[PDB]
C-alpha cells in the first residue's frame, strides 16, 4: 500500500544517479587538505568520526564469503568500488577478442550458436569506445565545462556494465556446451587461433630455460640456497658428480653458495595423494616435489641437478640431470621436470599471485576505508594502490572459484581442497616475514655475487628501494616525530583492524615513523610491484600447457630409465584445461590499468591524486619518486640488453598502481 508523501525520494533515486552523485562528491571531498586527527579542529574531527562511521556501513567484513571460506573479504563491492569506465573498456576489449577468437577456431556448424552474439559485442564495444573518445575530445575542446561532462562518462560507465553483463551470459553458454565443444601437442597449439604461441613454446624442453623459471618466472619467491641437503632428498656425491663434472662435490658447491632447492611441501591439499578423478577434466595428478639446482664453478647460468617427484624418497626414485647420449634416461627426465611445472602453476597461482598479492591488498583496501578518513594523508596516499581491488577479489571468488568453474577444471586438487588451501596460505603470510628485503635475507639468495642471475630480486629491490624513499619523504610531511605516529588515533584503528579483522598475520602495533615507513612500502609494493611481477608473466609463460600446467593427466614418472614419448605425452592435460588456460592467462595478464607513480585519477577527470601544495611541490616528495622511477626504468633496460632474456614485468612503466587483475 501506498503513496505516502514520506517515498517522494525513492521514486526518482537510481544507481546511476547515485554513482554520478557519489562521483561528482568524491571531487569534492578530495579539495579538503590533508590532516591527521590529532591536527584537525573540532569540526574536522567529528565529520571525520561521522563518515568513518557510515564508512562501516558499506564497507563490511566476512569470513564466510562465498568460495573462499576463512578469508576475510568484503561482504559486498559499495557502488563507489564498481571499476571506472577505462578498466571496463580495456577489460571488456580484451574478453570480446578472446570470445571472437575461440568462436573462429569453432567448426562452422558449432559456431553458428554464438557468431552473432559475439559480433554484437564486438560492434556495441567500438560504439561505446567511440562514445569515450568523443567525451574525451569535448573535454579538451571546452576545460572549464569539463565538470558538468561526469554525468555522461556515468552513463558510459552504465553502457559498459550492461555489455559486461552480455559478455557474461554468452561466456556461461559457450561453458555450458564447453565438453561438448571438444607432435601430438598440436591440440596445445590449436587453442590459440589467431594468437600467437609465448616465448615458451619453443625453448620449454631446454634444461636451463627450466632452471631459469626459478630466477625470472612467475614464481621467484620458492627457490632458497641449500647448505646441507634434508634427509628426505638422498642425493649422493657420485649423482652430482655424474651431473656436475668430475672436479665438483656437493660439500664444496653448498660451502661455496652454489647450491639451490626448490621444495614444494607446502603446497599440501593442492598436491593430491593419488589419482583425482573429474566429470569435466577426467583424471588428474598434482604432487609436492623437491628438485635440487645447482650453479657451475663459473657461475654462468643455473642447472637443474636432479628430481624426486614428492616428499617420500621410499616412494619416489631419484631423477637425474641426463647426458645428451643418455637416450634411455631423457623422456623419465622430461616427465620429472613436468612434475615440477604442475607442481609451480599450483604453487604460483593459489598462493603468490592469489594468496600474497589479491587478498593480502583486500585486508589493506577494508581497514584504509573503515579507519583512515578520506581526509587522513595516508588515506589519500593507499586509496589509488587498491583501485578495483575489492571487485576483482569478488569475480575471483565468484567466477574463478565455484565448482566446474576455471580454477576447479585447470588445478586438479578437488575445489574445496584448492578454496581451504589457498585459503590457509593466505591466513598464515605473515607481513614482516614476507618483505621482499626480508624474504631474500630468509633464503640467502639475496647476495649477487653468489647467485648473479636473479631479475626479480635485482629489478625489484630497485623497485622497493624507490618506493620506501617516497614512503619516507611523504610520512614525514606529516609526522614530525614518532609522538605523532603513537598520537594518531585512525592510524591505531587502522591497525586494529588488519590484526583483528584483518587476519593479517605478523602485524604488529605502529609505534614510531621507521616502522611506519616499512608498513607503507610493502602495502604499497604488494599491491602494485609485487602484483605485477607475479600477474604480467602469465600470458607469456603459462598459456601453453606442455610447458606448465596445474593437473597432469599421468602420474609422476615411476622410473628414470625406459621411458618413452607416448609416456610423457600422457602427462597432458585434456584440450578444455588448455582452452581454459589460454583463455583465463591471456585476460588476466593484458589489462595494465593505472601506473606506480602516475598519482593521478585513472578515470574522468584524470585530476591529481595530491592537492597538497607540500607533496606536489617542484622538485618536491611527489616528482622525486616520479623521478627515480624513470631511473629505474632506464638502469632496467640496460640490464636487459646484458641478460639472457628480457626481465621486463618490473619496468616501472609496466606496474600498475594496484591490484585490478
Ligand atoms: C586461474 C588462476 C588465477 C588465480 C588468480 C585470481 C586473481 C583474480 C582474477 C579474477 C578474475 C575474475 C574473472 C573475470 C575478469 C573480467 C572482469 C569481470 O568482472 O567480468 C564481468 C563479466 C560479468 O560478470 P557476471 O557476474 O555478469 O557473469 C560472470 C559469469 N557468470 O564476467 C565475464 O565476462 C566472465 C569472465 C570470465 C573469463 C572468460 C575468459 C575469456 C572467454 C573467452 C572464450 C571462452 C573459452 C573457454
Ligand atoms: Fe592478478
Excluded at 652430482?240 to 647450491?259: I, K, N, T
Excluded at 643455473?302 to 641426463?322: K, N, S, W, Y
Excluded at 606496474?655 to 585490478?660: G, H, K, L, M, V
Amino acid at each position: 500500500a501506498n503513496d505516502s508523501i514520506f517515498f517522494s525520494p525513492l521514486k526518482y533515486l537510481g544507481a546511476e544517479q547515485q554513482r554520478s552523485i557519489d562521483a561528482s562528491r568524491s571531487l569534492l571531498d578530495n579539495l579538503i587538505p590533508p590532516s591527521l586527527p590529532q591536527y584537525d579542529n573540532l569540526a574536522g574531527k567529528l565529520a571525520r568520526r561521522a563518515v568513518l562511521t557510515s564508512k562501516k556501513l558499506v564497507y563490511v567484513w566476512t569470513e564466510n564469503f562465498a568460495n573462499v571460506k576463512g578469508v576475510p573479504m568484503a561482504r559486498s563491492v559499495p557502488l563507489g568500488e564498481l571499476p571506472n569506465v577505462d578498466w571496463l573498456l580495456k577489460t571488456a576489449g580484451v574478453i570480446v577478442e578472446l570470445i571472437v577468437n575461440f568462436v573462429a577456431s569453432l567448426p562452422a556448424s558449432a559456431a553458428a550458436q554464438f557468431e552473432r552474439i559475439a559480433a554484437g559485442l564486438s560492434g556495441d564495444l567500438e560504439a561505446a569506445r567511440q562514445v569515450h573518445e568523443a567525451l574525451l575530445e569535448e573535454a579538451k575542446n571546452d576545460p572549464a565545462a569539463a565538470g558538468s561532462l561526469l554525468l555522461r562518462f556515468t552513463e558510459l560507465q552504465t553502457r559498459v556494465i550492461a555489455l559486461l553483463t552480455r559478455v557474461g551470459l554468452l561466456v556461461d553458454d559457450i561453458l555450458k556446451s564447453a565438453s561438448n565443444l571438444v607432435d601430438g601437442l598440436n591440440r596445445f597449439r590449436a587453442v590459440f587461433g589467431t594468437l600467437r604461441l609465448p616465448e615458451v613454446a619453443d625453448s620449454f624442453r631446454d634444461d636451463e630455460a627450466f632452471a631459469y623459471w626459478r630466477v625470472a618466472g612467475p614464481n621467484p619467491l620458492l627457490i632458497r640456497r641449500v647448505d646441507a641437503l634434508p634427509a628426505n632428498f638422498p642425493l649422493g656425491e657420485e649423482q652430482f658428480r655424474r651431473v656436475m663434472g668430475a672436479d665438483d662435490s656437493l660439500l664444496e658447491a653448498a660451502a661455496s653458495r652454489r647450491l639451490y632447492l626448490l621444495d614444494y611441501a607446502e603446497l599440501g591439499k593442492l598436491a593430491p595423494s593419488g589419482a583425482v578423478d573429474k566429470l569435466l577434466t577426467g583424471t588428474g595428478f598434482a604432487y609436492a616435489p623437491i628438485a635440487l639446482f645447482a650453479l657451475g664453478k663459473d657461475r654462468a647460468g643455473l642447472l637443474p641437478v636432479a628430481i624426486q617427484c614428492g616428499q617420500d624418497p621410499a616412494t619416489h626414485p631419484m631423477f637425474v640431470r641426463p647426458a645428451e647420449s643418455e637416450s634411455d634416461l631423457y623422456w623419465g627426465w622430461q616427465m620429472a621436470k613436468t612434475v615440477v611445472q604442475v607442481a609451480e602453476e599450483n604453487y604460483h597461482e593459489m598462493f603468490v599471485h592469489l594468496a600474497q598479492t589479491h587478498l593480502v591488498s583486500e585486508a589493506f583496501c577494508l581497514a584504509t576505508q573503515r579507519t583512515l578518513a578520506p581526509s587522513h594523508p595516508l588515506h589519500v596516499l593507499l586509496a589509488p594502490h587498491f583501485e578495483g581491488t575489492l571487485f576483482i577479489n569478488e569475480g575471483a571468488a565468484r567466477i574463478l572459484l565455484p565448482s566446474a568453474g576455471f580454477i576447479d577444471v585447470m588445478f586438479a586438487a578437488p575445489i574445496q581442497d584448492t578454496q581451504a588451501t589457498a585459503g590457509g596460505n593466505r591466513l598464515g603470510f605473515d607481513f614482516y616475514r614476507g618483505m621482499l628485503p626480508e624474504s631474500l635475507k630468509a633464503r640467502n639468495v639475496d647476495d649477487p655475487a653468489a647467485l648473479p642471475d636473479y631479475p626479480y630480486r635485482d629489478d625489484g629491490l630497485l623497485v622497493w628501494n624507490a618506493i620506501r624513499q617516497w614512503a619516507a619523504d611523504y610520512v614525514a610531511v606529516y609526522y614530525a616525530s614518532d609522538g605523532d605516529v603513537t598520537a594518531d588515533v585512525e592510524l591505531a584503528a587502522w591497525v586494529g583492524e588488519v590484526i583483528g579483522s584483518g587476519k593479517v598475520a605478523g602485524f604488529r602495533p605502529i609505534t614510531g615513523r621507521s616502522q611506519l615507513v616499512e608498513v607503507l612500502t610493502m602495502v604499497i609494493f604488494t599491491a602494485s610491484a609485487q602484483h605485477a611481477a607475479v600477474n604480467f608473466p602469465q600470458p607469456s609463460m603459462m598459456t601453453y600447457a606442455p610447458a606448465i600446467c596445474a593437473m597432469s593427466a599421468a602420474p609422476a614418472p615411476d622410473s628414470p630409465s625406459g621411458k618413452s614419448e607416448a609416456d610423457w605425452l600422457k602427462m597432458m592435460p585434456p584440450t578444455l584445461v588448455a582452452l581454459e588456460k589460454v583463455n583465463i592467462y591471456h585476460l588476466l595478464g593484458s589489462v595494465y590499468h593505472g601506473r606506480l607513480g602516475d598519482y593521478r585519477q585513472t578515470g574522468f577527470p584524470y585530476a591529481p591524486v595530491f592537492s597538497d601544495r607540500r607533496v606536489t611541490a617542484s622538485g618536491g616528495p611527489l616528482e622525486r619518486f616520479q623521478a627515480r622511477l624513470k631511473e629505474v626504468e632506464a638502469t632496467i633496460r640496460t640490464r636487459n640488453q646484458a641478460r639472457r632474456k628480457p626481465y621486463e614485468y618490473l619496468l616501472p612503466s609496466r606496474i600498475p598502481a594496484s591490484t585490478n587483475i
